[PDB]
Amino acid sequence: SSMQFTDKATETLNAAAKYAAENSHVQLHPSHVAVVMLDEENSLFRSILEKAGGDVVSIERGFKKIMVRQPSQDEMGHSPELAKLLHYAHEHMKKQRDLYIAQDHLILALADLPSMAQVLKEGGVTKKSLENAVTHVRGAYEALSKYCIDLTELAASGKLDPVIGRDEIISRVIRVLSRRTKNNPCLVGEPGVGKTAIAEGLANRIVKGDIPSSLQKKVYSLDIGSLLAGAGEFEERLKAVLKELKEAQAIVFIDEIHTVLGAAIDAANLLKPMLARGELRCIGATTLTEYRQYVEKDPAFERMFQLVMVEEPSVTDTISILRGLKERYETHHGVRIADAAIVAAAQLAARYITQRFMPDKAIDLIDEACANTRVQLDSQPEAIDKLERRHLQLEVEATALEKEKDAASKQRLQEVRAEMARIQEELRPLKMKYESEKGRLDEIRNLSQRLDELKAKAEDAERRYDLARAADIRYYAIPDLEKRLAQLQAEKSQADAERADGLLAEVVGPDQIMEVVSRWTGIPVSNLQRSEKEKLLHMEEYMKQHVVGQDEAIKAICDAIRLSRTGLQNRNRPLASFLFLGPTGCGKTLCVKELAAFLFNDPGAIVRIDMSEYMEKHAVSRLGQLTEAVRRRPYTVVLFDEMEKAHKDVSNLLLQILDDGHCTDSKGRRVDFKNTIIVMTSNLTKNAVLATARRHFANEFINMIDELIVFNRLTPSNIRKIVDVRLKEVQERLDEKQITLDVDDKAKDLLAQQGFDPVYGARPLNRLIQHALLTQLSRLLLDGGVRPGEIAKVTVDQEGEIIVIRNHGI
Numbered sequence: 001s002s003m004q005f006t007d008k009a010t011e012t013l014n015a016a017a018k019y020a021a022e023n024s025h026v027q028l029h030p031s032h033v034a035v036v037m038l039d040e041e042n043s044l045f046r047s048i049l050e051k052a053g054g055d056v057v058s059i060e061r062g063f064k065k066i067m068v069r070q071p072s073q074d075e076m077g078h079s080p081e082l083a084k085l086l087h088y089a090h091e092h093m094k095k096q097r098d099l100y101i102a103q104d105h106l107i108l109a110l111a112d113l114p115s116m117a118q119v120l121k122e123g124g125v126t127k128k129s130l131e132n133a134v135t136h137v138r139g140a141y142e143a144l145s146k147y148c149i150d151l152t153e154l155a156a157s158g159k160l161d162p163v164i165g166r167d168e169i170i171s172r173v174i175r176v177l178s179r180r181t182k183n184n185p186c187l188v189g190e191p192g193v194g195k196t197a198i199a200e201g202l203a204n205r206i207v208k209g210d211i212p213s214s215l216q217k218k219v220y221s222l223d224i225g226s227l228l229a230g231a232g233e234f235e236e237r238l239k240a241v242l243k244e245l246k247e248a249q250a251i252v253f254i255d256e257i258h259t260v261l262g263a264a265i266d267a268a269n270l271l272k273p274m275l276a277r278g279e280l281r282c283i284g285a286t287t288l289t290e291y292r293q294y295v296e297k298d299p300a301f302e303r304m305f306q307l308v309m310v311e312e313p314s315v316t317d318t319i320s321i322l323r324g325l326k327e328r329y330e331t332h333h334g335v336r337i338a339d340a341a342i343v344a345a346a347q348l349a350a351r352y353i354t355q356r357f358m359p360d361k362a363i364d365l366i367d368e369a370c371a372n373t374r375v376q377l378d379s380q381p382e383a384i385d386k387l388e389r390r391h392l393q394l395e396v397e398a399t400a401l402e403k404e405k406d407a408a409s410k411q412r413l414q415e416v417r418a419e420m421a422r423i424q425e426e427l428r429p430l431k432m433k434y435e436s437e438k439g440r441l442d443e444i445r446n447l448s449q450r451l452d453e454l455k456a457k458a459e460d461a462e463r464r465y466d467l468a469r470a471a472d473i474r475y476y477a478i479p480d481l482e483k484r485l486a487q488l489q490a491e492k493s494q495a496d497a498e499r500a501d502g503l504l505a506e507v508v509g510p511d512q513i514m515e516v517v518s519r520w521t522g523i524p525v526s527n528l529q530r531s532e533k534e535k536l537l538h539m540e541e542y543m544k545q546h547v548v549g550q551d552e553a554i555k556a557i558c559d560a561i562r563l564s565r566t567g568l569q570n571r572n573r574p575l576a577s578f579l580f581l582g583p584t585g586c587g588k589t590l591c592v593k594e595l596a597a598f599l600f601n602d603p604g605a606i607v608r609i610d611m612s613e614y615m616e617k618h619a620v621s622r623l624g625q626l627t628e629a630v631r632r633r634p635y636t637v638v639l640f641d642e643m644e645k646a647h648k649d650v651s652n653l654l655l656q657i658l659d660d661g662h663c664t665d666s667k668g669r670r671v672d673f674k675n676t677i678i679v680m681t682s683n684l685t686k687n688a689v690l691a692t693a694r695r696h697f698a699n700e701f702i703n704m705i706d707e708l709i710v711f712n713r714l715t716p717s718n719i720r721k722i723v724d725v726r727l728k729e730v731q732e733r734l735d736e737k738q739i740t741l742d743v744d745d746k747a748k749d750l751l752a753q754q755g756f757d758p759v760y761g762a763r764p765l766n767r768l769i770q771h772a773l774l775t776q777l778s779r780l781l782l783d784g785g786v787r788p789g790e791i792a793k794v795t796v797d798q799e800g801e802i803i804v805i806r807n808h809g810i
Ligand SMILES: Nc1ncnc2c1ncn2[C@@H]1O[C@H](COP(=O)(O)OP(=O)(O)O)[C@@H](O)[C@H]1O
Pocket: 161, 162, 163, 164, 165, 166, 189, 190, 191, 192, 193, 194, 195, 196, 197, 198, 285, 321, 325, 359, 360, 363
């Protein structure tokens, strides 16, 4: 009588009693209940009877026959046979060890009522048909372990870091794998962009069930180098691998897949038949250049693989990747990574590690900086070590004196005990403050590592439906450790506030990241912590360090660079474009050198094109070569000397790049120029020469250009300054011998007037300094004439030539 029901069961009964009242019936009858249930939106009872084999349309009419006979008049009582339905529901509820009468308890109870059981027999439902349908609704590979990595196992064991910000590509891999043709994804990108992480991320989704049911598959990574180690036995190992994949019906990730298709033994004829018979399902990884040689060039591989590009993440996306990996390195090294460390890792790796790719190179900075911090933390503090070591000396000295009986030994022993005790008074506090801070910090680390191991074991128990083990872990072990960890994080914060030493020892901040970046690059830290904004605002100072007398040209160059870097220029353009119109010998090439060294980190990242040899009419086909230079190093200045020599074939090739942003290769490929600067020189007061230019040029190509600079002639004061900086370069070499190069006005005037020519500028200057100064200077350094620590005087002799006065005879 006094029973407990689910809300859904109570709703069924109330609905049964309202249907009873709608046929004006005196009291509620199990056929009311049965019919109400069969008619519920998305009826359970209907689905159970369909699965038990029943004829739901006859069963319902049969229930409606018993229901029609029930007596009528004109509150709601229970039929003796309803009261019996609830008795049996309640007995099922107890047999299943359930606590509330649920709607499947009513369905099973209908079958206990002989009247209701008959209707179900006449619809084909036996009692074993009905019981089975409701019980339902409630509830080794040798070569793969030698040669592959079970990548879905790593995911299930927690041994695999999170994969952040690649959910579009992972889901694209899943759609490709599900195509009828071209259903083998080939991850194509450069080293370190995360091609392997995309395979690892799919493994992760497979283990969590965020996949279609057609990809509940293991993912094995084929170790190609492991196939070759220890030797035609390559072919026999691979066949056994492919056989065992095929029957575990797994997906195979193959890194460096080109090295098994031609790049060192070739197994293309082993893989190809299997990939085509669909026997093998495969995820490749390789680089774009190698995809084009070994997968496109074979028509039958192109027909089975799909190119999936994996681009390098930007600085913004790398910071997101780092914020996601952060806890994993913190828990591993026992350190705190400040967010500014992350930001500085991504920004400095983007700007100073230009030979390597995101996110690998930034992660790599973090790891090294974390390892540095933990080395320091694990090192003995110097003050405790100095005292421990001096106390050890004293104690060995006391052992020796302990048995000497002369007065002088007794006296020295008392001095030794007094110095021992003094050290102990200074040492004991320092040692117990180190042992408790270090001990606490270690325990935070150890507990944090056990919390991860527990969470993974608990997530494993849950997927396997091991409730007892997941229950021990989630509710007893994890909370026990979380509480202890919380106590220590509180003790630590109080202990740090009471030291007030201003020291964040366990903290990897920007200083630590730059210590690494300095080391990896040899650039001192001081040069590293200017922002990109300050370097850009002083860019003019950078060039003024070597380019003399061209202050106007430098302002124009630098402003145009700043337009690009502030994002104010059109994306469908190159970074910048200048036409250097000045006298030769004044510093056109020097400015290009300066740009590559400032704008790209690499002074040699310049691509030169003489145009007199590209004056041929079909020279553009050979430009070919132009495409492959800025594909290979995309961050590059692109210098065009003798632009006069340029045919109107090549003139209109730049107008593409300049108004489009990329050149189309002679094979159809797009070679990107969005990170090149483009410079063009031409030999062709100030206010007049600019207009002699204008009388020549096609306007649509010159307005496409950012700046048109007019360089100015080296004036006699710029002439002395250029020669004074060359002598400074000579001095910088003599400083390790402590020599001083005193050059007088007579000689600087000789270098001034004889080192500079009216049309070829400062080109003569350097041969003159080698022949007229450094040659005799080299003779004097060798024969003792000028010695370390001396002044080497330079003047001009009575015949008219540079002389280096000598300080000693031969
Ligand atoms: N999206 C990402 N999220 C987290 N870690 C990533 C991501 N992409 C790459 N990584 C990590 O960066 C490093 C380089 O990636 P990896 O997959 O090995 O590159 P590739 O296979 O292209 O050479 C690895 O430590 C990898 O775990």
